[PDB]
Write a protein that binds this ligand. Structure first.
Ligand SMILES: Nc1ncnc2c1ncn2[C@@H]1O[C@H](COP(=O)(O)OP(=O)(O)O)[C@@H](O)[C@H]1O
Ligand SMILES: Nc1ncnc2c1ncn2[C@@H]1O[C@H](COP(=O)(O)OP(=O)(O)O)[C@@H](O)[C@H]1O
Ligand SMILES: Nc1ncnc2c1ncn2[C@@H]1O[C@H](COP(=O)(O)OP(=O)(O)O)[C@@H](O)[C@H]1O
Ligand SMILES: Nc1ncnc2c1ncn2[C@@H]1O[C@H](COP(=O)(O)OP(=O)(O)O)[C@@H](O)[C@H]1O
Lengths: 743, 484, 262
């Protein structure tokens, strides 16, 4: 490609001149005084006059700073140059000065600057061009916004110009089409990777894709909670690849006037057809295309059918990609899912802890933070937040810093503007306040994320860990052996044992080891979904588990069904069987292709419905015994991290003494010890408090407060309240059931 | 309406033509869902135009719809749409044929196994297969961007002929793809044959008698005037292969097989009862001949008898609908009904009536030579080594069911897999320190499952079928032999 | 829609403007409530104008609704109405300030106990107190209708300054007045002190440890590792002093109290 050209410094200072080398000049067949089109980054064009220069190298183009600013490039970049012999002479232009160039001028710009520069100049101009004018003592900056014809015109003696108007701002707010590259997205690595994978080819290289003869995608759905940054993803992709991003808003299209709404939508599609590889973004799709039964009037049906027709009318045409955003996948009319229409579904989920840290790191860029910010805990204590909430949090933190500072009787002379932000910072207290006065918007949304509990957190249980890593790790890492040998891997494991032995810890540990998502369905929700809603909820939870593979779906307190079934009511039995039967039907519909692992946990195995325990469904049964000896020491050490452990004492004898104790009792003892220590510390502090009030000026020197003396005596007093969580007969029942299992 | 009238009028004057109306339900839904007033006008106008086709020309109208119950029933009288044709979801051979058709252009390297891909894509339809092929081709192109010069204009020719699509691309395309059928009843001829079943020869003879002769030589039945039995009910211990006999006889008769399990039946208790059963029987009649199968027929009474007493009404709903749509059926459209249950004492006596399910066949626990037969059946697709005596294993396992033997067979292969992977991990631990020091050339250890694997599998085992259940079934059989 | 557009475009030019959309639920109700089509057009017009408000001359929009679940759920996305501030029913003292504000001009007699009336009346809002005061004034002025009753020139200030509204008029006006709030959950600070109860010396210590410390010294709790307790369950013979204990601890901790009955 003999069009790519690296940039270089220019010799002459004229605005509309670039120096070209003779070999390229003859190669490209250019002549003196001609006009060419210069294309740079961020979709910027430029018109110039080609000039010859032997000094400039072939690979380098000599060009000045004004054109570099106009094209938004820098030294060492690449700019393509194309001949432009079809330039049309202009007839009228509009020129306006920038805001920060006419301070205290108060004169007519037509004769002082415009007339000397534009006489016999023949300088072509284009929209968006920023150029500098040198005159008496100030460098006047001018902006050309209107021309005829547009955007190509040439200054001629028989032309009329006008410079009457208010001094326009620098670039107003036109930062979106220059900003929001890939540097402005955090915590969306996989989704962004998929979008880049499946969109780069149809937008970057259309000719090759046409030549191949393969159908491109024609629709992509981005569904997620509001404020997670979907339109920002679309804007970033369109602005990066290079296209004609053309946004359509839902509500504005809806209520235009009576029956003329579809005319605007058709005009939008027609405009996008004519104007090169472009991306059409439809926002709030559910607002215009809800479910068919939901619609009551007739205009809505007309709008939906018009959208469907215009979608099916995209056969070949050009390289147009349609992207839509919606809140809930089932809220869209199911007719908008056939092949040819929206078919590819991408899920933008709530950010996780690392995602929250990345978002916070991105946003806190203009602010000059103090040397006390440790955003790790600030991120990890904000579960249930989206991007917009974090942006609002940063804004409120800055405003609260202003509040704690104030313009102290500072007369607002506009002089105190730059030292406002360049004197201040942020401290923990501001962010803690903002967190306190915050309104999370996620709350009740199922969280999909890799848990952080490792094998070290649990203690002992070597055989059970071995069995789980056997049943989970091998089929995913060495599937070739299973395929060649011809076996079906197991699909479910059921944990049964006395309560509080650490089943969910083990499930989260294996989820962390496998590096797969985790979804927890607790007992209360399962019991709730009896009364009505016995089909939907199960449907979307299984669908979400499937689509985000790999994952380890967890069902806790599975016996609660028949536990609530038995009693003085006997009315949830139909609800019980319907819930269990949707569970069973969805479980049998699984396919081995997706690595979806089901784990159920219960503490009363004698009551579970026997239909579950069949091949294909949950089959393997693993028994979790009570911790013993080394397990007790391991769990005591695991609970013994804290910040204030001091040097402390041995833990062996504590494990030796307790016999018939589960994890709940040990955690209870650990909490009791810390409670006693804190009570002692606070009463000592209060003693110091009223002894200072008794004796003023007694402790003018800042004597050290009592240390974290977590003493043996405090532990021995606290754990004195030792409770036996589990009875004894339950162990016999469990062991009898286990012996019944073995034959 | 002007567009519709102009369409029929234009097709009138342009020779024998075919009018295709796509998405019929989108314009003519049921009259209960017609909310506005314009749709009623449109539907009436369509009906008049349809009824006005007296002579005119040789114009044939074809329409497509998703739910046959979603169309206005007025469009079913004679003169209008009368002929019903059903296009079902393709089966395994159909999927292989579709894949063969859609891959005609591309160049495939001599490593792709289209049969495996066909077998690994249950739940797809034609459009999904086309999309799969397209995605595989695009992935193959993208992997080799270096060879093709993207440059500034059209591609070359030898480069395209040089590209090859490999099995890895097909697997990658499979991974990132979701099907669309899934929750749909499957109507397909099963693949299990007689040799897959161990023992049970007299029951095979009886089933062949009660299905094959009335269809093999219906002329003799017509001559002698026999009414063939509509239904047959199986009963016996759990996990002895009733579904296997059903599938095998369906395959041997070469007829469609439709299976309804207990979960679907209990889900169709609450609320939707009449519509679901009516639709199932309609689908069975449409695809005749077929062997409709009902499994876990006793779940009705299993859930009815408890501490709830609220599921009994819907249980009666299901049973009554089954009886109502079964007794009033035409056997000319061959629909053989088979039911299976392992709790025969509680089954409603109304089912055991002439005209309904009458014949009763007992499936015994496979014994002696049947153990050798079943172990031969399960060791047809596993490289067991020739050092284990199947005879002693067969003669050691008195009072064992088929499911138990299959579990025992798979346990030893689990041990083999763990042993092989442990050996490979150990090997990788060794030769990662000594660089390529192997004077003797050894490949991956050949499958060599020896006696100790089966000995250890046998040590930890099960006896699923209980002894009291056997005498319960024997008492029930004697009661049927004497009282009835 | 023309009126809405004209209102917004007029307000945006007058510099720091503050638009107030009274009775929001009347034009943008819950989605399923609407039946016709003009309501959808009006709601969408409001939404698009709100989205189109970009900086401008710092125009601020406030909307007043009755309960924050009747409006359309779409008017809570970021950019639109996002900050919610509630205005609860005044309780105890608030009624005293409202009454002292309204009974400003009138010359109360020295025997009037505004505090007693404030303590007695509950389930009333500001409008009810204003109406009560007005009715009291009229009751006071009617019994002395021998003032002029004839003079076209209004009453001289002389006699009109000789009206001492007494407690009797206030009680009469309070008697014949129907409140409006009534069945509303009450959020307030109970006034029971730690002297209303006499016993339960160690239960006081237990409640103190469970309640006061987390909000006083969070640093030691967060350093030592414990998560503070979230619930406490009382049990014992019926009657005794459970409710008094809850009210007393709510008073001492200086926090609102919400009660739910069986
Ligand atoms: N990395 C990010 N992830 C999510 N949201 C972000 C990110 N960076 C910025 N945002 C926020 O997203 C907002 C824009 O997204 P928005 O228009 O709310 O999407 P939608 O309209 O789909 O909710 C910006 O105001 C910005 O504060
Ligand atoms: N290996 C272990 N053995 C015993 N207890 C543990 C172990 N690991 C963690 N624990 C403690 O035991 C508790 C387990 O509670 P959880 O597993 O939620 O109850 P359940 O066992 O009923 O699911 C946790 O609070 C944890 O601190
Ligand atoms: N020849 C055979 N006899 C008995 N059981 C078999 C045979 N071949 C396979 N099986 C096992 O029986 C199971 C199918 O039994 P099925 O017909 O479902 O009986 P049930 O309905 O009592 O479970 C299969 O999982 C298979 O492993
Ligand atoms: N100092 C006190 N100690 C115990 N009881 C008291 C004390 N003062 C009042 N009481 C009585 O105790 C009763 C508490 O009962 P109540 O609050 O009605 O139900 P509960 O049984 O939930 O407390 C009150 O009715 C009150 O009259």
């Amino acid at each position: 490609r003999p069009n790519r050209l690296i940039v270089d410094e220019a010799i002459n200072e004229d605005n509309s001149v670039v120096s070209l080398s003779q070999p390229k000049m003859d190669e490209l067949q250019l002549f003196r005084g001609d006009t060419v089109l210069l294309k740079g980054k961020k979709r910027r064009e430029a018109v110039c006059i080609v000039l010859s220069d032997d000094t400039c190298s072939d690979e380098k183009i000599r060009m000045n700073r004004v054109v570099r600013n106009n094209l938004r490039v820098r030294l060492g970049d690449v700019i393509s140059i194309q001949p432009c012999p079809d330039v049309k002479y202009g007839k009228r232009i509009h020129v306006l000065p920038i805001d920060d160039t006419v301070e205290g001028i108060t004169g007519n710009l037509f004769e002082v600057y415009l007339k000397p520069y534009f006489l016999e100049a023949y300088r072509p101009i284009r929209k968006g061009d920023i150029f500098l004018v040198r005159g008496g003592m100030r460098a006047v900056e001018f902006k050309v916004v209107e021309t005829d014809p547009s955007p190509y015109c040439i200054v001629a003696p028989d032309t009329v110009i006008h410079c009457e108007g208010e001094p326009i701002k620098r670039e107003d707010e036109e930062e979106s089409l220059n900003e929001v590259g890939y540097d402005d997205i955090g915590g969306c690595r996989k989704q962004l990777a998929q979008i880049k994978e499946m969109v780069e080819l149809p937008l970057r290289h259309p000719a090759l894709f046409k030549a191949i003869g393969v159908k491109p995608p024609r629709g992509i759905l981005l569904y997620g909670p509001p404020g997670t940054g979907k339109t920002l993803i679309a804007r970033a992709v369109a602005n990066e690849t290079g296209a004609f991003f053309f946004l359509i808003n839902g509500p504005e299209i809806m209520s235009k006037l009576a029956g003329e709404s579809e005319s605007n939508l058709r005009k939008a599609f027609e405009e996008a057809e004519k104007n090169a590889p472009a991306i059409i973004f439809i926002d709030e799709l559910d607002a215009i295309a809800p479910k068919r039964e939901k619609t009551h009037g007739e205009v809505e049906r007309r709008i939906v059918s018009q959208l469907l027709t215009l979608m099916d009318g995209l056969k070949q045409r050009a390289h147009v990609i349609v992207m839509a955003a919606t809140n809930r996948p089932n809220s869209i009319d199911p007719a908008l899912r056939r092949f040819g229409r929206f078919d590819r579904e991408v899920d933008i989920g709530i950010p996780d802890a690392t995602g929250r840290l990345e978002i916070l790191q991105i946003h806190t860029k203009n602010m000059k933070l103090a040397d006390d910010v440790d955003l790790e805990q600030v991120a990890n204590e904000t579960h249930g937040h989206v991007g917009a909430d974090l942006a609002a949090l940063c804004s409120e933190a800055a405003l609260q810093a202003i509040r704690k500072k104030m313009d102290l009787i500072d007369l607002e002379d506009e002089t105190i503007d730059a030292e406002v932000m360049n004197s201040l910072a942020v401290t923990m207290d501001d962010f803690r306040w903002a967190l306190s006065q915050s309104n999370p918007s996620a709350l009740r949304e199922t969280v999909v994320e890799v848990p952080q509990v490792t094998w070290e957190d649990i203690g002992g249980l070597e055989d059970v860990k071995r069995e789980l890593q056997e049943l989970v790790q091998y089929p995913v890492e060495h599937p070739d052996k299973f395929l060649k040998f011809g076996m079906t891997p197991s699909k479910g494991v059921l944990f049964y044992g006395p309560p509080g032995c650490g089943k969910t810890l083990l499930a989260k540990a294996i989820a962390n080891e496998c590096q797969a998502n985790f979804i927890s369905i607790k007992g209360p929700e399962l019991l709730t979904m009896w009364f009505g809603e016995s089909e939907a909820n199960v449907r979307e939870i299984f669908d979400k588990a499937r689509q985000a593979a790999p994952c380890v779906l967890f069902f806790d307190e599975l016996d609660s069904i028949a536990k609530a079934r038995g009693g003085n009511i006997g009315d949830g039995g139909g609800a019980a069987d319907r819930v269990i039967n949707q569970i069973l039907t969805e479980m049998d519909g699984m396919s081995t292709k997706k690595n979806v692992f089901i784990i159920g946990a219960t503490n009363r195995p004698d009551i579970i419905d026997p239909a579950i325990l069949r091949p294909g469904r949950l089959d393997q049964l693993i028994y979790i015994p009570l911790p013993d000896e080394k397990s007790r020491v391991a769990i005591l050490k695991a609970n013994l991290r804290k910040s204030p452990v001091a040097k402390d004492v041995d833990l062996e004898f504590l494990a030796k003494m307790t016999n018939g104790f589960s994890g709940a009792d040990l955690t209870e003892i650990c909490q009791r010890a810390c409670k006693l220590a804190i009570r002692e510390s606070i009463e000592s502090e209060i003693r110091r408090e009223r002894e200072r009030q008794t004796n003023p000026s007694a402790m003018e020197v800042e004597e050290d407060d009592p240390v974290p003396e977590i003493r043996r005596d405090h532990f021995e007093e606290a754990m004195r309240f030792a409770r036996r969580s589990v009875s004894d007969n339950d162990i016999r029942k469990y062991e009898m059931f286990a012996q019944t299992l073995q034959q | 309406e002007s567009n519709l009238r102009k369409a029929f009028e234009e097709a009138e004057k342009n020779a024998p033509a075919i009018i295709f109306i796509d998405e019929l339900d989108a314009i003519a839904p049921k009259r209960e869902k017609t909310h506005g007033e314009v749709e009623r006008r449109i539907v009436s106008q369509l009906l008049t135009l349809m009824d006005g086709l007296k002579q005119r020309a040789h114009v044939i109208v074809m329409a497509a719809t998703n739910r046959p119950n979603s169309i206005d029933p007025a469009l079913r009288r004679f003169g209008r749409f009368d002929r019903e044709v059903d296009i079902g979801i393709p089966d395994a051979t159909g999927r292989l044929e579709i894949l063969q058709i859609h891959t005609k252009n591309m160049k495939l390297a001599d490593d792709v196994d289209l049969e495996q891909v066909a077998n690994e894509t249950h739940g797809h339809v034609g459009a999904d297969l086309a999309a799969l092929c397209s995605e595989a081709a695009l992935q193959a192109i993208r992997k080799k961007m270096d060879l093709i010069d993207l440059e500034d204009e059209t591609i070359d020719a030898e480069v395209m002929n040089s590209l090859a699509v490999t099995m890895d691309d097909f697997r990658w395309a499979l991974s990132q793809s979701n099907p669309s059928a899934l929750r749909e009843t499957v109507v397909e001829v099963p693949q299990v044959t007689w040799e897959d079943i161990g023992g049970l020869e007299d029951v095979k003879r009886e089933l062949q008698e009660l299905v094959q002769y009335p269809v093999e030589h219906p002329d003799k039945f017509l001559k002698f005037g026999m009414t063939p039995s509509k239904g047959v009910l199986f009963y016996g211990p759990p996990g002895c292969g009733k579904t296997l006999l059903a599938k095998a006889i369906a395959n041997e008769c070469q007829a469609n097989f439709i299976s309804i399990k207990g979960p679907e039946l209990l889900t169709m208790w609450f609320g939707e009862s009449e519509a679901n059963v009516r639709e199932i029987f309609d689908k069975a009649r449409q695809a005749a001949p077929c062997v409709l199968f009902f499994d876990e027929l006793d779940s009705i009474a299993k859930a009815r008898g408890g501490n709830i007493g609220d599921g009994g009404g819907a249980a009666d709903r299901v049973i009554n609908q089954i009886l109502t749509e079964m007794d009033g059926m035409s056997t000319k459209k061959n629909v053989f009904i088979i039911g299976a249950t392992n709790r025969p004492d509680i089954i409603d006596p109304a089912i055991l009536r002439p005209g309904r399910l009458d014949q009763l066949i007992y499936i015994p626990l496979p014994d002696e030579k049947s153990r050798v037969a079943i172990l031969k059946a399960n060791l047809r697709k596993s490289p067991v080594a020739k050092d284990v005596d199947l005879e002693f294993l067969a003669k050691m396992t008195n009072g064992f069911s088929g499911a138990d033997l299959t579990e025992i067979c798979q346990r030893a292969c689990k041990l083999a897999i763990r042993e092989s992977i442990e050996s490979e991990i150990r090997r990788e631990r060794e030769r990662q320190t000594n660089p390529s020091a192997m004077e003797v050339e050894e490949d991956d250890p050949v499958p060599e499952i020896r006696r100790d694997h089966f000995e250890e599998a046998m040590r930890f085992a099960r006896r699923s079928v209980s002894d009291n259940d056997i005498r319960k079934y024997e008492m029930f059989a004697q009661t049927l032999q004497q009282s009835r």
